[PDB]
Design a protein around this ligand. Sequence first.
Ligand SMILES: Nc1nc2c(ncn2[C@@H]2O[C@H](COP(=O)(O)OP(=O)(O)OP(=O)(O)O)[C@@H](O)[C@H]2O)c(=O)[nH]1
Ligand SMILES: Nc1nc2c(ncn2[C@@H]2O[C@H](COP(=O)(O)OP(=O)(O)OP(=O)(O)O)[C@@H](O)[C@H]2O)c(=O)[nH]1
Ligand SMILES: [Mg+2]
Ligand SMILES: [Mg+2]
Lengths: 54, 54, 169, 169
Amino acid sequence: AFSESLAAEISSVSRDELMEAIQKQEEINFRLQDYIDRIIVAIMETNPSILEVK
Amino acid sequence: AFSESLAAEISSVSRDELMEAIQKQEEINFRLQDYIDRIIVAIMETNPSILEVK
Amino acid sequence: EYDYLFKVVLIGDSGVGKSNLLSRFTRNEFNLESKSTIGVEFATRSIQVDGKTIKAQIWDTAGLERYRAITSAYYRGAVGALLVYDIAKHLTYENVERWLKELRDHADSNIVIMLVGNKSDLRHLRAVPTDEARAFAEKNGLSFIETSALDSTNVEAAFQTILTEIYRI
Amino acid sequence: EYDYLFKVVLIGDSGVGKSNLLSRFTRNEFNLESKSTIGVEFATRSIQVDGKTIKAQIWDTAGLERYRAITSAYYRGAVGALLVYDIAKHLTYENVERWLKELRDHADSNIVIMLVGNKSDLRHLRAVPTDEARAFAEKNGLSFIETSALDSTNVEAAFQTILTEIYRI
Ligand SMILES: Nc1nc2c(ncn2[C@@H]2O[C@H](COP(=O)(O)OP(=O)(O)OP(=O)(O)O)[C@@H](O)[C@H]2O)c(=O)[nH]1
Ligand SMILES: Nc1nc2c(ncn2[C@@H]2O[C@H](COP(=O)(O)OP(=O)(O)OP(=O)(O)O)[C@@H](O)[C@H]2O)c(=O)[nH]1
Ligand SMILES: [Mg+2]
Ligand SMILES: [Mg+2]
């Protein structure tokens, strides 16, 4: 029924708060990947042999 | 009014899909942080001076 | 020992099978459960081309769209690019032009580019008709092949073909 | 030159102000916009204790609850721990016992522990009464001080006190 189908789509948390949690997690992902990429490019430009899957 | 307050709480995306997106992003965060921590512990146990904020 | 070392990069959207193409070619290994590539890696394999020993140096990284600190260095010195999409995901094929643009911005204009339709084993889930992509590659001056890293189909042929084109260029 | 080198670690929930306590003490710097600490870092400062030159080596990392590859090495050789909470966020104070347990699991049982109520400038937003936390520290054998990395209140005193206890232990 409709009320059951509607209930499953309503979170206990406000959508504003859910959106804030999305942005916070995306920011961290992007910061972590950048931190990693900065390490990797340093290795690429010094001793890229470190990157070989042997 | 009620219908307006309800509308703001309904995403165009199904909550099942929204939950899947949460889990996917949390998995990546945890994988990236672990990848970083593994690099950092290696440095801690070889040349920890690299970690100094000079 | 080798006569020539050719750096070839794998590019294409996240999830298309780049890492499994690498592992199949260089290790004869495949993982159904492989996760997104966190860093940058390469593996090697030596093949014979026109009597000469070609050490293929195949590079791999996540197919992220964002600016990355690794991008310039990734394409640096690359003589070939395997531009991979997923035959069972039309979006990854739509994004091919975006990868062609990344090549123009970050790689040698002389780079050999081969278009690769991966996951050809997914017959029931196919979203990109072979004839359509074949036509597209021709229109754009790219070599083309369909592969399955899963069942091995055309994987050897794919790398052999691009490395041979690079050698003869 | 120095007479003794004391490794002191900052611990406590994400957001409590660990990194700003570090920057205030070692650089006389504060950032309202500081983001979560990605890796592990340390900074030094030499102070005089009982006629002797003590080089304080203050370590910092994000206050994550999860298992981390860095944890054992982080506490390794530490003679002091600054266990920080946010006076304006009651949850960070609730989690103090969890940090005491991390110390038992990962650090020397002889480690000097000082409880730090940070952000004392946030008078209007206070959720943890000073008298309550003071009592808690006493009940648990911990030294106690309230700080503001923002306005500098008690920051010097906090580090001076813990380093002096370590020296005299
Ligand atoms: N059916 C089928 N699945 C494949 C094939 N190749 C890869 N996969 C699967 O597709 C998923 C993604 O493969 P990956 O090799 O990790 O993809 P990728 O391009 O390296 O992804 P990123 O590192 O995120 O850029 C995994 O579950 C693989 O097992 C294939 O040829 N056929
Ligand atoms: N009002 C006030 N804000 C502070 C104080 N100390 C830190 N902050 C702010 O609180 C936020 C978090 O501070 P951080 O120093 O980054 O906290 P942290 O403990 O290092 O956080 P993690 O690295 O995630 O573990 C930042 O916006 C700081 O500017 C303080 O004494 N008073
Ligand atoms: Mg990959
Ligand atoms: Mg911090």
